[PDB]
Design a binder for these strands. Structure first.
Ligand SMILES: [Ca+2]
Ligand SMILES: [Mg+2]
Ligand SMILES: [Mg+2]
Length: 429
DNA sequence: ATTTTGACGCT
DNA sequence: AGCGTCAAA
């Protein structure tokens, strides 16, 4: 009752760019705008692998991971843009730079946590308080929320936009605008701010995005996906029981893999809401102390993970796969590709040092051997003392050379199916 | 023969 | 330290 926390103490948003790499390419090439199109890496093998897909193309069934040749069977007029290749490998610089554009705009509004190349969490609690003080009891107009959905509404006693407006009207009609401590009002002001933030992103970059607004990161992330693209969704604390009552467990962030499968298998449930019937101790007994407490609160819509103040990636990495017959089988091959990776890494590190006043101090080398299901077969670290590609490639070879079983120095066995260099452990400079 | 990435947890 | 999990385009 009066002491039961309800996880309504924060306003958190998650902003996620729509079909991000596709929008980057469509901004650059107006011929691709408003078309079924996809972004692909490589082209020799089956037309290249698709990594991003416009919503027009998704209507034909085109998805990520599809070979372009196969996507063309579903969508013969599909347009394609290719990821840049440099030093023999795909190079994602254009998308990293577009990401910086968006992150820098979002940072003007509030502290953000960079969650991926195209998404960030926003802690809006303080901004909401400020805006509520500015508003001075003034009601919030639907015109301030032109792309907002209120999850769960409309309810009670045939076009998409009509339903959105009906739900928003029910919500705003029911709000108590004089209570500055009302969580629902705080979320609503949050959504007003997010409309402003999304408008700024689109104005200043050309890119559209979706967003979720709720009381914590997990619900904000879930909310964001409910009405893509180019829309935002408010998930209130009160919407949680109905929302979770038919929500597959795997849809909640962190439960899409083995742990989620085990929750389903061990407990014999399917939906997030069903978790409420277990005690905290029961959940801890199956999934561990940390996961158990997290599940117990999360299934009630409560999560405390903070929006971390971090706009920049914590690592800078470069990797290449060598699938099937292309696996690296000679020492020379391994050294040449380590050099290519190290040259890209050097370029990115030097730019990072100039832009962000920091230097990486550890180099992580990872390889995969043909026959291993795991992404990485072996990982070794060494000191990163100079931004020099020849030194980094030599040091990586030094730390992995003993993995070569082959009695012949010139041959590498078992062949390598992946090389990965990652700069970590940044210090101020 | 998806590939190329991050962030963080466990021991 | 080195390995595993989960998530992005
Ligand atoms: Ca996205
Ligand atoms: Mg994303
Ligand atoms: Mg996606």
């Amino acid at each position: 009752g009066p002491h039961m926390a309800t996880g309504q103490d924060r306003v958190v948003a998650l902003v996620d760019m729509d079909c991000f790499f596709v929008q980057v390419e469509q901004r650059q090439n107006p011929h691709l705008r408003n078309k079924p199109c996809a972004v692909v890496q490589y082209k020799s093998w089956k037309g290249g692998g698709i990594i991003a897909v416009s919503y027009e193309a998704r209507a034909f069934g085109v998805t990520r991971s599809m070979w372009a040749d196969d996507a063309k069977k579903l969508c013969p007029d599909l347009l394609l843009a290719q990821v840049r290749e440099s030093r023999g490998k795909a190079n994602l610089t254009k998308y990293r730079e577009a990401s910086v554009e968006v992150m820098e705009i979002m940072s003007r509004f509030a502290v953000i946590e960079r969650a991926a190349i195209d998404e960030a969490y926003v802690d809006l609690t303080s901004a909401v308080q400020e805006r509520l003080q500015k508003l001075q009891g003034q009601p919030i107009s639907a015109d301030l929320l032109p792309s907002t959905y209120i999850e769960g509404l409309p309810q009670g006693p045939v076009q998409k936009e009509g339903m959105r407006k009906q739900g928003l009207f029910q919500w705003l009609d029911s709000l108590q605008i004089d209570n500055l401590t009302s969580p629902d009002l705080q979320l609503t002001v949050g959504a007003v701010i997010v409309e402003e933030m999304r408008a700024a992103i689109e104005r200043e970059t050309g890119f559209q995005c979706s967003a979720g607004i709720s009381h914590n990161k997990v619900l904000a992330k879930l909310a964001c996906g409910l009405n893509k693209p180019n829309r935002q969704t408010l998930v209130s604390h009160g919407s949680v029981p109905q929302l979770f009552s038919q929500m597959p467990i795997r849809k909640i962030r962190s439960l899409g893999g083995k742990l989620g499968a085990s929750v389903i298998e061990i407990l014999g449930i399917e939906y997030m809401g069903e978790l409420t019937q277990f005690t905290e101790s029961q959940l801890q007994s199956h999934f561990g102390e940390k996961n158990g407490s997290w599940l117990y609160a999360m299934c009630r819509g409560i999560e405390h993970d903070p929006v971390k103040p971090r706009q920049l990636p914590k690592t800078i990495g470069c990797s290449k796969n060598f699938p099937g017959k292309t696996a690296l089988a000679t020492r020379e091959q391994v050294q040449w590709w380590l050099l290519q990776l190290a040259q890209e890494l050097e370029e990115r590190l030097t730019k990072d040092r100039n832009d962000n006043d920091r230097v990486a101090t550890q180099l992580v080398v990872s390889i995969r051997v043909q026959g291993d299901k795991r992404l990485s077969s072996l990982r070794r670290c060494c000191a990163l003392t100079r931004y020099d590609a020849h030194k980094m490639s030599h040091d990586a070879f030094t730390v992995i050379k003993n993995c070569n079983t082959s009695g012949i120095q010139t041959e590498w066995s078992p062949p390598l199916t992946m090389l990965f260099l990652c700069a970590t452990k940044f210090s101020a400079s």
